[PDB]
Ligand binder design. Structure first.
Ligand SMILES: [Mg+2]
Ligand SMILES: [Mg+2]
Ligand SMILES: [Mg+2]
Ligand SMILES: [Mg+2]
Ligand SMILES: [Mg+2]
Ligand SMILES: [Mg+2]
Ligand SMILES: [Mg+2]
Ligand SMILES: [Mg+2]
Ligand SMILES: [Mg+2]
Ligand SMILES: [Mg+2]
Ligand SMILES: [Mg+2]
Ligand SMILES: [Mg+2]
Ligand SMILES: [Mg+2]
Ligand SMILES: [Mg+2]
Ligand SMILES: [Mg+2]
Ligand SMILES: [Mg+2]
Ligand SMILES: [Mg+2]
Ligand SMILES: [Mg+2]
Ligand SMILES: [Mg+2]
Ligand SMILES: [Mg+2]
Ligand SMILES: [Mg+2]
Lengths: 244, 181, 170, 57
RNA sequence: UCUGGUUGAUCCUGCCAGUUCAUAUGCUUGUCUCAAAGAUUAAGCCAUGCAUGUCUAAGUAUAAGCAAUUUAUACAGUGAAACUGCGAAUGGCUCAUUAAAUCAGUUAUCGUUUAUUUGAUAGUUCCUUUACUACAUGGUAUAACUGUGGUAAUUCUAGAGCUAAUACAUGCUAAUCUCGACCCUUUGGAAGAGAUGUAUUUAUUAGAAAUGUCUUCGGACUCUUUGAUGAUUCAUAAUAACUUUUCGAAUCGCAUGGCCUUGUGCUGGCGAUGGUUCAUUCAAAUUUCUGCCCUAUCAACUUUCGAUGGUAGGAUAGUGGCCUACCAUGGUUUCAACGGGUAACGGGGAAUAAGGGUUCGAUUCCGGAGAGGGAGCCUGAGAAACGGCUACCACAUCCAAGGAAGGCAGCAGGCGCGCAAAUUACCCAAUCCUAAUUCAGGGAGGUAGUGACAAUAAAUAACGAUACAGGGCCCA
RNA sequence: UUUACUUUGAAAAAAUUAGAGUGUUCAAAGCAGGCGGCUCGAAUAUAUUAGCAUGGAAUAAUAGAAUAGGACGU
């Protein structure tokens, strides 16, 4: 091609969206945004194919232009806005709050949360670095830049971001015995505790995870997301608690 | 373009169509069950071949094998539900003992004849295609419809049928009108 | 017509490759800017993205650094004396990176006299060769900038082993 | 299919020019303005060779 | 692959006879659902029509537009035209070229650009002509429009007169922070000593036994002071200059709250669009390893005109013989180099088979390439674009003969024969994409029509009564 | 000791293939949620080679200061 693509065939769309193959020729192409294309749920898919509040794209646009939908506390009017893992979606007229978490099947689950839990989210630290004027900052998995982080925060840790202010309230270090959630691979959606991080310099690090049933599995460190201490997650978990 | 839609053939031509034993067997089958052509027999033979080949492959596997348990139980349950396999023969060994007549006895045409709603298999076919038969609340006009164990006792004349309590058909009321005139 | 693709070249075995596709804009080159000493003539080039380069078609001044003294002064460039890639660039007085040029010594001499009060004594001591150049009136300098890329003709004064090397080569 | 016969070789003379150039470099071992400007047979002779040699004989 | 013959009767070796898919074509063709539509190695040639435009309250209306009004006093509703902005680099089609190339899996960028999206981010107080616009600068300026015109002719345009901006081009407006003597002992005051953006180019620099004393029993007394990677000349910071040199809001909607020393004073809400740098996302370019059909009656090839490598420069977004200059003489090859053929785009896949194999894959998804053939470019974040431009080759249309205009391998529809095959249909309602934008646009896409492509189910009859006759069938 | 080899684990898009559930009236198909907590529901699998992590005692290569030496001069 001579520049960026703007369409998406339904067969080429992410499988976990569960789109009917005969419905049309195209799927909603997620727009640029906080999350990657394959790892995102556009608002149209959530509002129409998961919640069924809209019967088609035109009613999704009607809902969005009324300013009824908030993503992480901010109104979004873009139909293909790429909501993703750990995103909070608020619908005030229905008194509904959702957090985007995969189920054991590997698909984003319709997980309803309370208004108290809707006030924060968790971000995996992707980068810690000094910005201009020597101000440190952290970049999280959803593209948030947060300045003046606690000096103890490192990469692969998790921070608790208050949505109203976008500031770090607490953090969890990546260490053995921490509760982790698998966000990629064939174990996508499983929950367990870190047993060992196998390190390979110049290669991909590997993490052994033990589930509550004592089954062990190995995953790349890129697919691991710390969510709390064992027996005490920082977020409400979907049905099944990431087992099997 | 839009994604492809799947399809498949439901039958296959036999290895040697011209064997005298095969022709005589087909004659007896089509006569006893009132079949239209050899393609219906081929369709049933194709299904039975798939089922028995699956059972053979599962029996080759070790007992207590997870695949054997899962797929054999599914196959046995399906065959018992459709009525071909008896409740007292819930094993793959008896799945290998099945025959085409077992499936032909489950056709709605055969059931309509056997329950006494029709005087022959051909009268049963005519009754089904003419919208006189209901399975439960549903009119079924397909003779090859496969009756389940639970569905067996719900075969009846349809509410809309002249034989099911509705008014007479065109012929009867035409004759009555001319007789009155 | 300039392209930087590697497909037109022979394989490492020596095989002649066939044309895969027509030339692409993302693999182009442009005409060199043979910068020469004279009144400042610079024209912008719109490069990939919105970015811009500066083509020094002509230049006669530059910011040259005395690294031992830790200073920089703007100075007139007299001419090109030596070039390690091609002598025709010296013959035509073409300014590129790594060219050895002669620069006016006046601003550096003035700074030295102001700072050291001399034409303290230990700190004022410099290399014999540099002081001999100051007596001559011109200093040997090496251009550290890329004139055809940034539009600047910055450089530094040759000292020590590098100065000895280039004095031999001259 | 580098040098296969084309339906209309005259209509693509520019393409044929490249092919001749490609052959030359490839087979060399065996042998051994600006448009964007503002202003712009053998048997018979052999058989004949047999007569004259015969007649001269 | 089997079956029957060749003997008085067997065995072996031979002979004889019978034993889906692809192309073309013949006849028949009622009902339901469903679905496809290539082919002269001719990527041969195309009449006609359509397939890309786009406006919110929120960039620019004295249209001599329309319509309103408490009948208008800068404007204000709605709004053609034109400017400005964005898109037109996606989509759709085709398989010509292409044999370590594309492609598949697997890597790298500590080797580079990236519109847009998302998140962060920029008080520099002062510094002589204060002879001072910031209660806000210019034409260094125009379109539409008005009017006068040329040409046979085109989405051709000339001369003249006007007038805007988020176009273009200029240019401003008593701060904050360190210590802090002295008082006072805190909710402290502050004499005073000091400090002060970005962007560009270069040079230089940093980036590594207090185990005590007192105390109110708390606490205080002296010291610490960058981070990351497996790894960096990394992030970041500092000094001195440098620059045809940047940026640091002269923009727009809705609304009319708060202080008073009552002034059209000061202050002030929710938004739109912009803007520097970083991060992110959508991408792009390059890149590591392994893997292709036939040919050895192709054994040496590459290097003169870059082939392999070194140094330096130039160019590039950037690495690199990518190019140039000067140096070496290297690089590949019987483990098949190089050359030749390919009715060679690669793959996911399809067919067959008991297994090994073998054939097919233009063809719904992904990647690549092309737009009659070579070559070159403008604009732009992005194109070596072709429903963009310029030349040359080949075809070809109009002409008043002076000129002007071309690219269906997009959707329909034609020619390529004298012998043959879907509609020049309806619509953006669904799917999604584009725009300034919920609304406009979309031959993308969908709807229906049209040779039995491949498939699914399935009618053309069912049930009775009576009369007559004596033969009907099977084997051999 | 190292390699080959072999085991296990990631990886190898979706569609297609196999398989599970589901009276599209049947079927070819398409499809993921039901009742008022119910311990209900695709449980899923599949790929020669190359690269990555990992357990191995044989086999085939590959290694050893392995079981070595101790006499003279001015
Ligand atoms: Mg394209
Ligand atoms: Mg994994
Ligand atoms: Mg009826
Ligand atoms: Mg009908
Ligand atoms: Mg606007
Ligand atoms: Mg070749
Ligand atoms: Mg945009
Ligand atoms: Mg931004
Ligand atoms: Mg640096
Ligand atoms: Mg170089
Ligand atoms: Mg050279
Ligand atoms: Mg070809
Ligand atoms: Mg394609
Ligand atoms: Mg192209
Ligand atoms: Mg053509
Ligand atoms: Mg553009
Ligand atoms: Mg072109
Ligand atoms: Mg066209
Ligand atoms: Mg195009
Ligand atoms: Mg066409
Ligand atoms: Mg179409």
């Amino acid at each position: 091609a001579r520049g960026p693509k703007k369409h998406l065939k339904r067969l080429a769309a992410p499988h976990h969206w569960l789109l009917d193959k005969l419905s049309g020729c195209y799927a909603p192409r997620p727009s640029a945004g906080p999350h990657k294309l394959r790892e995102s749920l556009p608002l149209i898919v959530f509002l129409r194919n998961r919640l069924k509040y809209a019967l088609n794209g035109r009613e999704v646009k009607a809902i969005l232009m009324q300013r009824h939908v908030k993503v992480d506390g901010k109104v979004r009017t873009d139909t293909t806005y790429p909501a993703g893992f750990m995103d909070v979606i608020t619908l005030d007229a229905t008194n509904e709050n959702f957090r985007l978490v995969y189920d054991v099947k590997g698909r984003f689950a319709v997980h309803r949360i309370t208004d108290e839990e809707a006030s924060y989210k968790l971000g995996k630290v992707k980068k810690v670095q000094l910005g201009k004027k020597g101000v440190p900052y952290v970049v999280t998995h959803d593209g948030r830049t947060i300045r003046y982080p606690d000096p103890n925060i490192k990469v692969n840790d998790t921070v608790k971001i208050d949505l109203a202010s976008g500031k770090i309230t607490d953090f969890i270090k990546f260490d053995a015995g921490k509760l982790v959630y698998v966000t990629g691979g064939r174990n996508l959606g499983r929950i367990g505790t870190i047993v060992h991080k196998e390190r390979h310099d110049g290669g991909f690090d590997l993490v052994h995870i033990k589930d509550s049933l004592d089954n062990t599995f190995v995953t790349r460190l890129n697919n691991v997301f710390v969510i709390g201490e064992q027996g005490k997650p920082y977020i409400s978990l979907p049905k099944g608690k990431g087992i099997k | 373009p839009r994604a492809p839609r799947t399809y498949s053939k439901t039958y296959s031509t036999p290895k040697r169509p011209y064997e005298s034993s095969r022709l005589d067997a087909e004659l007896k089958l089509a006569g006893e069950f009132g079949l239209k052509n050899k393609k219906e027999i081929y369709r049933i033979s194709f299904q039975l071949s798939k089922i028995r080949r699956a059972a053979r492959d599962l029996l080759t596997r070790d007992e207590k094998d997870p695949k054997r348990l899962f797929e054999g139980n599914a196959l046995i349950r399906r065959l018992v539900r459709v009525g071909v396999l008896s409740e007292d023969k819930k094993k793959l060994d008896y799945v290998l003992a099945l025959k085409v007549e077992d499936f032909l006895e489950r056709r709605l045409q055969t059931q309509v004849y056997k329950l006494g709603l029709a005087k022959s298999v051909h009268h049963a076919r005519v009754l089904i295609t003419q919208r006189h038969i209901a399975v439960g609340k549903q009119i079924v006009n397909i003779p090859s419809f496969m009756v389940r164990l639970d569905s067996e006792k719900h075969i009846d004349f349809a509410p809309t049928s002249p034989f099911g309590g509705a008014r007479p058909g065109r012929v009867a009321r035409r004759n009555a009108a001319r007789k009155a005139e | 017509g300039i392209s930087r693709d590697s497909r037109h070249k022979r394989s490492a075995t020596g095989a002649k490759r066939a044309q895969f596709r027509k030339k692409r804009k993302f693999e182009l080159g442009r005409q060199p800017a043979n910068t020469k000493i004279g009144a400042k003539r610079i024209h912008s080039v719109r490069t990939r993205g919105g970015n811009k380069k500066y083509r020094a078609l002509r230049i006669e001044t530059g910011n040259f650094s005395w690294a031992s003294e830790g200073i920089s002064k703007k100075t007139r460039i007299a001419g090109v004396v030596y070039h390690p890639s091609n002598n025709e660039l010296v013959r035509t007085n073409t300014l590129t990176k790594a060219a050895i040029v002669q620069i006016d010594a006046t601003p550096f001499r003035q700074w030295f006299e102001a700072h050291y009060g001399q034409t303290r004594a230990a700190s004022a001591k410099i290399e014999s060769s540099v002081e001999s150049q100051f007596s001559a009136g011109r200093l040997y300098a090496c251009i550290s900038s890329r004139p055809g890329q940034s539009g600047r003709c910055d450089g530094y004064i040759l000292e020590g082993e590098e100065l000895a090397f280039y004095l031999r080569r001259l | 299919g580098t040098y296969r016969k084309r339906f209309n070789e005259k209509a693509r003379s520019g393409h044929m020019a490249k092919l001749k150039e490609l052959k030359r470099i490839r087979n060399k071992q065996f042998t051994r303005p600006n448009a964007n400007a503002e202003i712009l047979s053998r048997l018979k002779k052999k058989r004949l060779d047999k007569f004259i040699e015969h007649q001269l004989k």
